[PDB]
Amino acid sequence: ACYCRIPACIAGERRYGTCIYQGRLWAACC
């Protein structure tokens, strides 16, 4: 599954895109 994260993905995840909520930009991390 993919998670929304700030400021970076966590261990063993890779960034594939972006989430938008609460007026902020999140890394989509899978």
Swiss-Prot record:
Disulfide bond residue pairs: 2-30, 4-19, 9-29
Documented effect of changing residue 26 to A: Almost complete loss of bactericidal activity
Modified residues (ADP-ribosylarginine): 14, 24
Sequence positions bearing Phosphotyrosine: 21
Regions annotated as coiled coil: none
Top-level taxonomic group: Eukaryota
Protein name per Swiss-Prot or TrEMBL: Neutrophil defensin 1
Full-length numbering of the shown residues: 65 to 94 of 94
